[PDB]
Amino acid sequence: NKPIKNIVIVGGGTAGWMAASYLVRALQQQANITLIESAAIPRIGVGEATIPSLQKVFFDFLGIPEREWMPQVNGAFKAAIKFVNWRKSPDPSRDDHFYHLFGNVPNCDGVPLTHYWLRKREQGFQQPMEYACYPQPGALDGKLAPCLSDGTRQMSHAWHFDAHLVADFLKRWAVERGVNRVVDEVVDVRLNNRGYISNLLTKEGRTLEADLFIDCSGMRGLLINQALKEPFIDMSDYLLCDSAVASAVPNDDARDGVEPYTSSIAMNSGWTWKIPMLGRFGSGYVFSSHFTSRDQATADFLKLWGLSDNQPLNQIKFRVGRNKRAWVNNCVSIGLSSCFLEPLESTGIYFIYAALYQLVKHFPDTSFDPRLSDAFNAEIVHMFDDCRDFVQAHYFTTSRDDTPFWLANRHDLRLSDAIKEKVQRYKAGLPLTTTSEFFWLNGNYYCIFAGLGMLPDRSLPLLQHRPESIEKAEAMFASIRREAERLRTSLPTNYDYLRSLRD
Amino acid sequence: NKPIKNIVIVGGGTAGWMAASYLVRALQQQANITLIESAAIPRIGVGEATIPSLQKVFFDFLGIPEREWMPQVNGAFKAAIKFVNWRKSPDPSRDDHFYHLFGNVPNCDGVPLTHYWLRKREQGFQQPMEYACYPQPGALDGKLAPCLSDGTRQMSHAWHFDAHLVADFLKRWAVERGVNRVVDEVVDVRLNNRGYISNLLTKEGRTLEADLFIDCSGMRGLLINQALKEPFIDMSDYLLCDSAVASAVPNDDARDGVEPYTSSIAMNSGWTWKIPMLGRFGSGYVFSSHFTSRDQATADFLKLWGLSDNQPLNQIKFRVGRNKRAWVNNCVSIGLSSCFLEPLESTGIYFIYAALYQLVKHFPDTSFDPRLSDAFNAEIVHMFDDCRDFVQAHYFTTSRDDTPFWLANRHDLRLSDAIKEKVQRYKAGLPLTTTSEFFWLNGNYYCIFAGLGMLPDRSLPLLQHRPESIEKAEAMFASIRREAERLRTSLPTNYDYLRSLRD
Numbered sequence A, B: 001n002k003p004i005k006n007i008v009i010v011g012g013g014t015a016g017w018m019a020a021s022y023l024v025r026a027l028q029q030q031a032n033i034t035l036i037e038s039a040a041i042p043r044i045g046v047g048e049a050t051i052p053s054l055q056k057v058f059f060d061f062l063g064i065p066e067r068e069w070m071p072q073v074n075g076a077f078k079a080a081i082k083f084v085n086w087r088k089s090p091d092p093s094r095d096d097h098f099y100h101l102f103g104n105v106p107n108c109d110g111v112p113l114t115h116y117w118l119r120k121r122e123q124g125f126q127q128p129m130e131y132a133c134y135p136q137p138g139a140l141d142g143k144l145a146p147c148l149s150d151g152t153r154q155m156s157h158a159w160h161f162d163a164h165l166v167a168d169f170l171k172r173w174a175v176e177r178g179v180n181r182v183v184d185e186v187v188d189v190r191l192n193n194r195g196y197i198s199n200l201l202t203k204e205g206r207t208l209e210a211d212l213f214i215d216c217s218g219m220r221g222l223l224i225n226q227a228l229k230e231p232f233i234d235m236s237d238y239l240l241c242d243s244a245v246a247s248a249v250p251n252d253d254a255r256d257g258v259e260p261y262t263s264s265i266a267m268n269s270g271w272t273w274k275i276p277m278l279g280r281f282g283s284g285y286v287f288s289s290h291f292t293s294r295d296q297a298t299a300d301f302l303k304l305w306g307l308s309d310n311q312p313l314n315q316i317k318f319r320v321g322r323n324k325r326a327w328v329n330n331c332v333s334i335g336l337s338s339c340f341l342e343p344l345e346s347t348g349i350y351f352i353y354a355a356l357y358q359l360v361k362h363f364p365d366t367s368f369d370p371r372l373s374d375a376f377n378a379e380i381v382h383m384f385d386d387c388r389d390f391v392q393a394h395y396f397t398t399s400r401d402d403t404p405f406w407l408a409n410r411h412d413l414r415l416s417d418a419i420k421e422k423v424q425r426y427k428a429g430l431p432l433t434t435t436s437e438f439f440w441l442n443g444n445y446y447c448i449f450a451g452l453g454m455l456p457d458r459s460l461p462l463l464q465h466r467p468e469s470i471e472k473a474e475a476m477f478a479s480i481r482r483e484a485e486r487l488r489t490s491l492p493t494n495y496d497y498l499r500s501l502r503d
């Protein structure tokens, strides 16, 4: 069976160039890659915060270290997501914030630290879960960097970057290693009787042909949805947000610093992201068209940052779900042409590079062994499904009841059987998945659940039997405090740290 | 023009019930008052120390004497604020305390006693300003009451009271005289095209209507800020504190006594109040989120009183400023829905009752004469502005430089032109405002300035010319010493005094 030799990618957004660079890297020989991108159809000018796997899976795979791509994409550090007003009905006079931090929680004698903490909360300990279990939340509060000045790593971190530049950086990178860039628009797609893709017909006259097609076309799914007719499984019964109003905002870095984290500020009918980088931050009120008009959400979005009705904006509509199948025949969808959830925990870019890893792990020849396509499709489903559990979990555990949208999340959602079982295990008091990557651990469910004020019914029956164990955990809590303390006096601010990679 | 007949107050905190009782008292006829208070939204469980005007303006207006409301609100006496460690970089082996006392300082031959004192400090007198100029600081040191046992008044005093009870005492008082209490929550507010308030829609179904609306809704400013869209002028450029961590603490009254004063203990990134009453005292580390994390300030707050990490706390966020306008259209804001500074000299409750006095002084009919609204707004601005001068003055005169927060106060503040001119007049050696209520006199600026160790450049050129005058002041200093002395052997302790109003 002839190998796959000519590859066409449709689209030059983030999904498009990640595919070109990844595929140009994985396919060391017999590979010919063309990416076509309509300059009439712009990129979705967002997608800016990330999870730690980006370096390990994407950039390391390319052979580009953090210090090389960060400066060139206005890169900044994300140590966590800070959740603001998700817990109770909001109150200006109350401090309703929790972090969701990266990195694992230690175990004491085979039981995670979260669980020794809860036994303490049961005796009237007051300190919230994350401040007790992780060394860094206080640092983030003080806007500290995740490294010492000299560059040594002091916490787990992910990144915030400018979406446009990220695309340009990889465009330069890819073209350079022989990727062939075509600026044209695809208008017709031709199938054969069997139902495969023989050719793309472009606006400027070109007929495009290849063994293999990557649909990186955005939510229009030009190849996968339209041409190939593959169903999109709508999932608004699971998660309600379907729209966003976004923009960049000036930051006075020199006086307010630059937060080393993403914020998610709960609103009336959605929530708003804050993604700081040097000079500015990206922000977006992700909302639900069912519960608020787009014009009302604009008003809320401007009201929240004191913007002016003169401020240019990015008005966005999004589809929530996954194609029945990510890869059909000789077409594979990567990015928004495939499955989205909502930006709440940055699972998007992750769906891109994780899919490309799976694509290469399942790479076909021209016979198109459907056993490879099936295996691939199943991994996409599981990755997507897992993520959906976790995002969904931010919503149905809420105590807020002050708006129709918060009522619905609390009440009206369709919940997988898998998220119900996890919730019920947490409610009985059992740790979730711990460790000593295929992903969301006890520590993650715990920050989220504990942050929204749904705690387990009790601490572990087992603990009554292991008093020494309890003591050892006391010591581990004591180290953590020491570490938190050292960091306070040792990290440079995030503003100052970033400022020196070249200003 | 029809008179105002139906009045709705939103909120049943301290601001809420002071308004109901004051308005039910002022409006002897044609007045119908309803107060709505969400049992889902609690009172800010603080606001406990006061200035002398409370009786004269608020309680006297109601016809309630001191001996009637004190016992019923765990009332205690405040003779001054004692400032601890504000002067130098702290030292356990040094006694860094000054009082700010109530009451005026006498004048000798038209020049205040503070100024004869300074001429003496210039010859190497050592006794600090307040111990020389006021008869009572030594009494307070010995925790003495401000009255003889039989009840005769021996100094100027204000009060400490339990916030919750104060609200309940006036709730009982008001309802009783025909105030109509509604336990519901306001969720929607309806305007007309002109921009007035036609109705409040509640959670339980009620549509509320009235000629006149008092926003006593807390910092959420439900009517004034949210519905009516009135701007809040943020003033963090003037004063930096924006948060507090508070709690009640057990006092062994029988052995440590009960201080007849508020303390303000300067911290790393704020300062802490102590408000003793029988059995217990209220305490709060007011701090700045910019300079310390909330979790660090908790640690400092527990470390300072030896509390346990089991101790329930009141975690508070506050906004510093004033609405562009306190009263817009047919809405008037009283209390935290209007302007706050920070608890440093108890200007808060004072803003409530002073505003209510001004409201009645400017009371409208249904035509809503904007000349009345304007006049009112201007008095609020002037009262608020005056207070802000005085609080701000505690901060920028500091000599401390041992933390970033003390550095900023010393350096980074925006200072009104009015406080600069007062400072410059004090620096030249001129008395500030003296007397023989619309408020902060020479004696007040003097305790504060002199306490922090910023003294004038010299004594008054005039004094070189009036040696007899100097002598007469010597005698006045001699009386004061006699009085201080008599008091030492005549006042009962504050514990013993309070103990008998009914135990």
Ligand SMILES: Cc1cc2c(cc1C)N(C[C@H](O)[C@H](O)[C@H](O)COP(=O)(O)OP(=O)(O)OC[C@H]1O[C@@H](n3cnc4c(N)ncnc43)[C@H](O)[C@@H]1O)c1[nH]c(=O)[nH]c(=O)c1N2
Binding pocket: A010, A011, A012, A013, A014, A015, A016, A036, A037, A038, A039, A041, A042, A043, A044, A045, A046, A047, A048, A049, A050, A163, A184, A185, A186, A187, A216, A217, A218, A219, A220, A222, A244, A284, A316, A318, A334, A335, A336, A337, A343, A345, A346, A347, A348, A349, A350, A352
């Ligand atoms: C509101 C919001 C917020 C976020 C996110 C999404 C949304 C909707 N994401 C997801 C992220 O934005 C997304 O995964 C990528 O940045 C962009 O993916 P694409 O390239 O699929 O789409 P996109 O729609 O950007 O690009 C489409 C490309 O296809 C081309 N094209 C389309 N039709 C064509 C045709 N007919 N012919 C030729 N070319 C054609 C266009 O020219 C363009 O080059 C995210 N993820 C994450 O991990 N963290 C985050 O914080 C966020 N934030």
Ligand SMILES: Cc1cc2c(cc1C)N(C[C@H](O)[C@H](O)[C@H](O)COP(=O)(O)OP(=O)(O)OC[C@H]1O[C@@H](n3cnc4c(N)ncnc43)[C@H](O)[C@@H]1O)c1[nH]c(=O)[nH]c(=O)c1N2
Binding pocket: A093, B010, B011, B012, B013, B014, B015, B016, B036, B037, B038, B039, B041, B042, B043, B044, B045, B046, B047, B048, B049, B050, B163, B184, B185, B186, B187, B216, B217, B218, B219, B220, B222, B244, B284, B316, B318, B334, B335, B336, B337, B343, B345, B346, B347, B348, B349, B350, B352
């Ligand atoms: C940390 C700190 C410390 C101090 C002080 C403030 C702060 C922040 N103060 C100020 C003082 O606490 C304050 O002025 C009053 O005690 C409380 O004022 P309110 O009633 O505005 O607010 P508060 O927020 O207490 O009460 C709000 C009321 O509004 C109601 N409400 C809100 N929204 C509603 C809705 N939508 N529907 C129905 N009801 C609604 C609530 O149910 C509640 O009844 C003070 N002052 C002073 O003079 N000396 C001092 O020592 C101090 N100490």
